[PDB]
Structures are given as C-alpha cells and as structure tokens.
Amino acid sequence: NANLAPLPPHVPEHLVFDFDMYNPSNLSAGVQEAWAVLQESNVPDLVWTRCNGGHWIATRGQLIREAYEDYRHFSSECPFIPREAGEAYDFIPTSMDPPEQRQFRALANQVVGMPVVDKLENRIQELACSLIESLRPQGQCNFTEDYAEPFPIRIFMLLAGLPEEDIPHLKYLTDQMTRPDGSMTFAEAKEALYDYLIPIIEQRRQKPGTDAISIVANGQVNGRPITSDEAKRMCGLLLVGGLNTVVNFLSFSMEFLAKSPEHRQELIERPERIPAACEELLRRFSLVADGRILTSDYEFHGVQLKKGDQILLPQMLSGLDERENAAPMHVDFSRQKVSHTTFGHGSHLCLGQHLARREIIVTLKEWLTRIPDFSIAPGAQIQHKSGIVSGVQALPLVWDPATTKAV
Ligand code: HEM
Ligand SMILES: CC1(C)[C@@H]2CC[C@@]1(C)C(=O)C2
Ligand SMILES: [K+]
Ligand SMILES: [K+]
C-alpha cells in the first residue's frame, strides 16, 4: 500500500503491525475495541507500524508505564505522530522533560488544580443542572452538541475568561490537532491557536484579571517572570486539553449508559457508587494516545530502538490490557482494583484530572437524577473517530419525558 512507509533497516520485519491510529481497521466495533486488536494473542509487546510515517507502539501497560517513567530515553520533545506534528508541537509544559518541565508544570497546576476546581464547584453544578433540566422535557437530544461539548467547554471558557462565542473556532482548531479531518495540519492549527492567543495575552499582562490566562500571563516560573511566548505556549496547551478531553469522554460514557439499563439502574439504586463508576468508565473508555521520541539508541524489552524513533505509548491501552485487569472490556462498577493510565503516567500526569473527575461525577448524578431512563435513538449507528484523543461523532439520545423528573 502507498500508505506504508518503507520499513527502516533496524526494525525486525516480524514486529511489523500496520496499525493506523487515525483510522484503525476495526473502528466500527468501537474505538477502544479497535485499539484492543493490538492486544490479541499473537501480537508482541512492542510492534512497528508503517502507517503515518512509521513508528513503534507499546501494546501493554507494563511497557507503556515503563516508557513514560523513563524520560531520559523517551522524551516528550516530539510527542505526536506524525513526525511533522510532533516537531511543530511546542506546548508547555507537555513538550518538555524534567528537569526543565517542572517550573512550568507548577504554574500550570496553579491554574487548573484542585484548589481552583473546588472554586468552580457551584458553577459546574449549576451549569450541569440547567442544561439537563432544559433537555429533560424534550425527551430527545444530540448529546455531543447538547451536553458533552457545552458543559465542559463553557466551564473551561469561564475559567479562562474567554467569550463563549469563540468556541466554534477554538473547537475546530483543537479538533484538527487531535482528530485531523485533513483541512489543516497540526502546524497550521497550532499557528492559528497561537494567533488567537497573542493579543489576549498582551491585553491581560497589562490589565491582569483573575482568569487562568491572566494568571499564566502574569505568573512566575520558579521565581522569574514568564515571557509572552511562554505564556502563549502554555495557554495554548490548556485550551487543547479543555476543549477535547472531557468532551469526548462524556460521550463514550453516556453511549454506554444509554445501551445498558442495568448499569444505569445500579447507579440509580445506589448513587454512592458514582465515583467508583467514574473511575471504571475512565478505564474502560480511556481515549488518549500520544507518545515520545527516542533520545538515543536504546534496547527496550529486547528491541533495538534508534535515536529519533517515535514510539506511541497509548494511555488508552494500559487499562484495557488483560494483564492489568481481567475481563478488561467488561464494565464492573465494583471492580476491586481499577488499573489504568487514562490521565497519563510519570512526570506528565494530567493536571486537569481533578476538574475532569468533578465534571464526570457531577454529570452522572445530575443526569441520572433527572433522566434515569434513556436510550440511543433507534437504528442509530454510532460512530467513533480515532486520533491522539478519540471521540464520538454523534450521539442521538431519546427518552420518554413521562419517566423523567425535575429536581
Ligand atoms: C477525561 C479527561 C482527561 C483526560 C483523559 C486527560 C488525559 C491526559 C493525558 C493522558 C495527559 C499526559 C500526556 C503526556 O504524557 O504526553 C494529560 C496532560 C495534561 N492534561 Fe489532561 N486529560 C483530561 C482532562 C484535562 C483537562 C480538563 C485539562 C484542563 C485544561 C487538562 C490539562 C492537562 C495538562 C495541562 C496536561 C499537561 C501536563 C504536563 O505535560 O506536565 N486535562 N492529560
Ligand atoms: C495528549 C493531550 C490529552 C495532553 C493535553 C491535550 C493533549 C492533546 C496534549 O497535547 C497533551
Ligand atoms: K528491517
Ligand atoms: K517539538
């Protein structure tokens, strides 16, 4: 096939597995299911795909975790596939490895961490309730556009102090960086995101507000003032994380709940399990997959990796690995040890995970409280899209208003 890059001389031909992270062959079975083909009986722990320019792929949690811990060998400098995207990628602190990464990560943690999450509580609460109540009597909705997107995105735009009317443009840009439809390269999308931020950053460095952008823009990096460029590279990252992650995860979770009344009933009858349900769904419907670049030749698990080689370390796969969780594809809200790397692993552990869990848990209880019974619109063939961050194309839900209830 013309879509396969010539196998480099150092890569064993028996380790070739032409997986396409942007269009996996088994996609129709579900995106997680599609990626899980990498964990079928005769697939090695580490394979090489000739797709998207050619790159390694760690298929088991053990290797994924090990690689994310070894930043000296596996650098975040070029974290995205294809290589061109990885090279243009300069977001802070994600494109940096410790020790340099730390001073910036600390600043980022200050704008989206637990303390700020605690502060957004009521607003997150209020927004969830207002959106769901308005949908309730209608007995129908396009979940992705009617909740998954507006709920977490409006919260983020609130935190960032940006007008909601800017969401369409920003959402399109961040979409192109994770699930490219082809109308824009990662570099072009990045250039546009930065173009958007530049004047906003300059404005808030002059007239500081209390929003996340102002805090970053006027912040300090281990004692010294952050620069305009640094603030741009950090804010750009925050925007990408805030407009694509929780948005897509909510859809995977709700699609599942819509197709399984028994689980819904479990959460209805016993709402104290929602948090545990949240973690299990985070494991089962994990959706992120970025990676690293080899800093030098290095033998990893019996495989000769060469400097410059890119290796995809799918955060999504660790928790689906049967060597981490028995019956991985089964959703068990009572699962004893929910093992996963959904929020990453190592020095780059998701800073917005606390905000994400809050948004997910609030969604689960507030939705189930008002719309206990709902299903996927009859005949609907739900479609997933694969990428750095996988998602659900559309999720038409239906329900009988009579079975609902105001709160
Ligand atoms: C379902 C929700 C989310 C998932 C699954 C998720 C997942 C991840 C993953 C896997 C990484 C590590 C990437 C790497 O190691 O290269 C990461 C990093 C990060 N996430 Fe999230 N994330 C979520 C929500 C959020 C939200 C809402 C924000 C808020 C803006 C956010 C902010 C960040 C930041 C700033 C980093 C970079 C930290 C660093 O590089 O040191 N995330 N996230
Ligand atoms: C892989 C990610 C989820 C993480 C936050 C946004 C994202 C797409 C990045 O570029 C780093
Ligand atoms: K070879
Ligand atoms: K780079």
UniProtKB/Swiss-Prot annotation:
Example of a GO cellular component annotation carried by this entry: cytoplasm
UniProt xrefs under Gene3D superfamilies: Cytochrome P450
Chain sites annotated for binding heme: C350
Cellular localisation: Cytoplasm
Cofactor: heme
InterPro entries per record: Cyt_P450, Cyt_P450_B, Cyt_P450_CS, Cyt_P450_sf
GO terms under biological process: (+)-camphor catabolic process
GO molecular function: camphor 5-monooxygenase activity; heme binding; iron ion binding
Reactions performed catalytically: 2 reduced [2Fe-2S]-[putidaredoxin] + (1R,4R)-camphor + O2 + 2 H(+) = (1R,4R,5R)-5-hydroxycamphor + 2 oxidized [2Fe-2S]-[putidaredoxin] + H2O
Pathway note: Terpene metabolism; (R)-camphor degradation
The entry's keywords: Cytoplasm, Heme, Iron, Metal-binding, Monooxygenase, Oxidoreductase
Keyword DNA repair among UniProt keywords: no
Entries under CDD domains matching the protein: P450cam-like
Position of the signal peptide: none
Function: Involved in a camphor oxidation system.
Protein family according to the UniProt entry: Belongs to the cytochrome P450 family.
Name of the featured protein: Camphor 5-monooxygenase
Organism: Pseudomonas putida
Gene this chain is encoded by: camC
